[PDB]
Amino acid sequence: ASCNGVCSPFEMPPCGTSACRCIPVGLVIGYCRNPSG
Numbered sequence: 001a002s003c004n005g006v007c008s009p010f011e012m013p014p015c016g017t018s019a020c021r022c023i024p025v026g027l028v029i030g031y032c033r034n035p036s037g
Helices: none
Strands: 004-007 021-023 030-033
Touching: none
Parallel strands: none
Antiparallel strands: 004 030, 021 030
């Protein structure tokens, strides 16, 4: 499943997966985005 959602930039791994990366579009909140799109 393609990674997508909301994640705290402090959370590791974000969205329960190290394959994805969290975009810090907020002070303590961001969004999960897969490094494949």
